[PDB]
Amino acid sequence: SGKIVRAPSNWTTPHKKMLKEDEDQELIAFDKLLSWVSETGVGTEEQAKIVFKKINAYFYLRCLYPVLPRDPKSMKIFQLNLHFLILGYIIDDAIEKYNENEMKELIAGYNLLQSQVSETFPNFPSIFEMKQLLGNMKNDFSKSAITTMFDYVNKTTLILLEEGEIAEHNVLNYRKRLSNAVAVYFDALLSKTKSDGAMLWRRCFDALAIAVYMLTEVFSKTLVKNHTLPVSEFYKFYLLSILFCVVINDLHSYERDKLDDTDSVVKVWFKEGSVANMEAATSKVSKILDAIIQQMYLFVEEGKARHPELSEWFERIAYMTVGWIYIHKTVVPRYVSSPFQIEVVEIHENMISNWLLKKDAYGQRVVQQFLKNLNMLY
Ligand SMILES: [Cl-]
């Protein structure tokens, strides 16, 4: 085939087991999501139910975290982020239609509240109190968008503070980086209202993916372990993994992206004339995805050698990366129906070295040019 993506067999084992599980209704806590709908002013009960089914939201998040720790902190942050996946989707559906001035107004409201809210640590204001703080806004939905973002960041902070296991300065650093991710998400939307590489880099932030990647730090206890991995290296892993998501998503969304002005690497190839058909486009996508998995494997193995105390974190990033395959091929209805898909070939342990040696020039060039972006989220 020309559509093959190679991946280590043991990078897919957790997902295969997870997809046989029943939905965990107690963990989903749908009634608690409905309470948050009412409190935030985002969505309705009916809309929350429709979005949950459209995303297949529980299995969507479990594809990213097929191994999920059961300590209370991890369970609480998983549940909060499952609920925020729903509200964030509804917020995104609304504000991606904002024009430039509406996005600037939204960003200004978010930035006005940032210090006065964060400086109340650990006694954060409720959504009601925060809505009173905001100045008049021309678009009324913006107040609900802003205070939902803050309530999510505040609730995250309070979960991490529970029982004092994580030192406060690390809780606050995580909070700041999560708020940074929200700010860069808004900025990415603003940019779209006004090169190929800058377009691709923008695609890494236009869906707040960093927020779900940061959960790996909670689940694998990197906020409590003393380690020598600088924060910049965390984001190397995050952004390489996000690139995988962007590229496979562009393949599965092309039939829709064809018809609107959404950015897509497949659309760029057709516009520049570098692919003549979807067979060629799928081949190019497979070479990129395949190269990312090779580069991720090398980063994971080098990370484990240098920082053995973070071995679990490195592995979980690998699983999260493979999770995007299952999200697009198995879990999300609108992605599963794409006639344009890649095919996974599993690499067994005996063949790992020979797999890594066999590289593709095109896929490697895309990955190497992308990683040059790394040389504000943190
Ligand atoms: Cl501003």
Q: Please report whether residue 258 resides in a domain.
A: yes
- Rounded to the nearest angstrom, the distance between the alpha carbon of 177 and the centre of ligand 1 is 18
- What Å distances lie between residue 373 and 8, 182, 202, CA to CA? 27, 20, 11
Q: Please report whether residue 176 resides in a domain.
A: yes
Placement of tokens 């280590």 in the chain = 8
- Rounded to the nearest angstrom, the distance between the alpha carbon of 111 and the centre of ligand 1 is 5
For residue 357, give the amino acid letter.
L
- Rounded to the nearest angstrom, the distance between the alpha carbon of 170 and the centre of ligand 1 is 26
DSSP string, 162-224: GGG-S-HHHHHHHHHHHHHHHHHHHHHHHHHH--HHHHHHHHTTTT-HHHHHHHHHHHTTTTT
Number of domains in the chain: 1
Distance CA 83, CA 353 (A): 41
- Rounded to the nearest angstrom, the distance between the alpha carbon of 113 and the centre of ligand 1 is 10
Q: Which of 376, 322, 90 is nearest to 205 (CA)?
A: 376
- Rounded to the nearest angstrom, the distance between the alpha carbon of 102 and the centre of ligand 1 is 12
- What Å distances lie between residue 199 and 206, 256, 336, CA to CA? 10, 18, 25
- What Å distances lie between residue 164 and 12, 125, 247, 253, CA to CA? 35, 21, 40, 44
Is residue 97 within 8 Å of 91, Cβ to Cβ?
no
DSSP string, 295-345: HHHHHHHHHHHH-GGGHHHHHHHHHHHHHHHHIIIII-HHHHT-S---EEE
**DSSP letter assigned to residue 224:** T
- Rounded to the nearest angstrom, the distance between the alpha carbon of 196 and the centre of ligand 1 is 27
CATH number at residue 351: 1.10.600.10
- Rounded to the nearest angstrom, the distance between the alpha carbon of 278 and the centre of ligand 1 is 42
- Rounded to the nearest angstrom, the distance between the alpha carbon of 107 and the centre of ligand 1 is 6
DSSP element (H, E) containing 7: strand 4-8
- Rounded to the nearest angstrom, the distance between the alpha carbon of 46 and the centre of ligand 1 is 34
My answer on whether omega of the bond before 333 falls inside 30° of 0, hence cis, is: no
Query: What SS3 state is found at 8?
Result: strand
Experimental method: X-ray
- Rounded to the nearest angstrom, the distance between the alpha carbon of 220 and the centre of ligand 1 is 35
- Rounded to the nearest angstrom, the distance between the alpha carbon of 180 and the centre of ligand 1 is 14
Structural domain that includes position 201 = 4-373
Structure tokens at 178: 């999560």
- Rounded to the nearest angstrom, the distance between the alpha carbon of 159 and the centre of ligand 1 is 29
Q: Please report whether residue 22 resides in a domain.
A: yes
- Rounded to the nearest angstrom, the distance between the alpha carbon of 324 and the centre of ligand 1 is 34
Distance CA 157, CA 22 (A): 30
- Rounded to the nearest angstrom, the distance between the alpha carbon of 104 and the centre of ligand 1 is 7
**DSSP letter assigned to residue 347:** E
Contacts 24+ apart (CB under 8 A), 271-280: 278/254, 278/340, 279/2
- Rounded to the nearest angstrom, the distance between the alpha carbon of 261 and the centre of ligand 1 is 26
Q: Please report whether residue 378 resides in a domain.
A: no
Which residues lie across from 344 on neighbouring strands?
5
- Rounded to the nearest angstrom, the distance between the alpha carbon of 147 and the centre of ligand 1 is 16
Calculate the CA 96 to chain-centre distance.
17
Distance CA 196, CA 74 (A): 38
- Rounded to the nearest angstrom, the distance between the alpha carbon of 193 and the centre of ligand 1 is 16
C-alpha angle 285-291-348 in degrees, rounded to nearest 5: 115
**DSSP letter assigned to residue 164:** G
